[PDB]
Amino acid sequence: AFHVEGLIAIIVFYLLILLVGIWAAWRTRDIGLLVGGFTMTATWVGGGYINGTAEAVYVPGYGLAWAQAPIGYSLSLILGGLFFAKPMRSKGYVTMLDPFQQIYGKRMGGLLFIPALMGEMFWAAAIFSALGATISVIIDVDMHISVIISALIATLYTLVGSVAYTDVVQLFCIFVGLWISVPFALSHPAVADIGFTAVHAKYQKPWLGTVDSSEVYSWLDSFLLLMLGGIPWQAYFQRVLSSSSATYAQVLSFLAAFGCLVMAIPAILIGAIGASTDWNQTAYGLPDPKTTEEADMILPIVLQYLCPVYISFFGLGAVSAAVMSSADSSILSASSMFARNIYQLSFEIVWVMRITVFVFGASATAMALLTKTVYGLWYLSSDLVYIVIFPQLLCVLFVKGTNTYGAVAGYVSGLFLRITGGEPYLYLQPLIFYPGYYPDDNGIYNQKFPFKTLAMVTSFLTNICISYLAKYLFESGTLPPKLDVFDAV
């Protein structure tokens, strides 16, 4: 079962990427704009992005229409560059979570940090699942062992320790490996026409998908979740604030949105090919990946089984090295974020950062083992950030007069509505039943009502209303000044 040549391919491509990265630091017509756009693009585009996009297009329930994560995450970059970059630079922020700490305080900073940590952990679990899937496909060792060993190598690389300009190299490797495999994948005999499969059903439901009239309010509820929940993220905002000029940051965000839209095209195409593939003709055989509960592995499966041996060896393996190189970047960001926001500011740093790396890697790989979807992990990472952080970001940026009381009230109300609405991915039953609820195969009632958008708006309006209410109570003198536990007013 073990294949030596796949491991050699990963090792050679990883060493080549590392050599280019250290050579860039060894060297250390105004094309810095293009390189900055590539760098901003390479943050979101990784194993999780392309694997989740291919999965979302591949699954019959979703199709391309419900694959809102690439389009929504590009529109998040557009909306950030338009509206969020200029307030952030105008107010002089240096960190994404700095606005929360300035107004709400350090303890509420940690309270808002916890959903950010969980979003980072969901994203890292999706990245670990994608990387383990790719490794398990090409090396042909078991999925669980692949995830464990890949996460362990990433954890040791983060733990032990030049290496400059690597993001452009990983993005170029992913782009070349995908766009040199799509012509071979499309030309495979098993794959039918993807133009015909888009609107008509041959092997499964059409991969464009459809949105029912009742589901439209649901659809926007998802689309607003990914488009607005993808904005308050640390990896985007650190490079936004790092830029010297504001217009430079806006044009970088626009170029990044363009690059994300372009990089989604091979992922959507591979998802379409997987939805169009007659797997009985391929070496994968029957049952197909969605019956095998391996629909989250569709991108490595197409690149391995629908491409020639040399094309597979190069393209799938350049993708593997790039994804493993990008995997440790999320671990580093989340670990430094934990070390600085909680342990350093609120309460020598190297030991606690080491333990943070170890625990975050173990939790991410454990949930990568437990979960069976990459797109679901991506959506769930967006979900909690959209519910909690985004109303608070709107309140600290565009709303004047918000305070800690309204922050906690909106936090509690949004989390109460979100929890009582029920999350099918985490196998949580719903307590409050909005109109249009229906039970799925698992017996978890699924809401057709936009309860997540309602929860977001409720949290935002509760923040505003409770902030102004507490301000009026303390200003007029209705409540005693002694009962000021949060020191907001």
Author numbering: 2 to 29, 47 to 179, 183 to 368, 376 to 517
The authors write:
Mammalian sodium-coupled high-affinity choline transporter CHT1 uptakes choline in cholinergic neurons for acetylcholine synthesis and plays a critical role in cholinergic neurotransmission. CHT1 belongs to the mammalian solute carrier family SLC5 which also includes Na+/glucose cotransporters (SGLTs) and is classified as SLC5A7. CHT1 functions as a symporter that utilizes the chemical gradient of Na+ ions across the plasma membrane to drive choline uptake. TMs 1–10 constitute the core of CHT1 with a classical LeuT-fold in which TMs 1–5 and TMs 6–10 form two pseudo-symmetric repeats and TM1 and TM6 are broken into two short helices.
The CHT1apo structure adopts an inward-open conformation with a solvent-accessible vestibule extending from the cytosol deep into the substrate-binding pocket at the center of the transporter. The intracellular vestibule is surrounded by charged or hydrophilic residues from the cytosolic halves of TMs 1a, 3, 5, 6b, and 8, providing a passage for the cargo release from the central substrate site. Two major conformational changes are observed from the apo to the substrate-bound state. The first occurs at the substrate-binding site where the surrounding aromatic residues, including W62, Y67, Y91, W141, and W406, must reorient their sidechains to accommodate the substrate. The second conformational change occurs at TM8 whose middle part bulges toward the substrate site upon choline-binding. The subsequent second Na+ release from Na2 ensues the straightening movement of TM8, rendering the transporter into an inward-open state ready for Cl– and choline release.
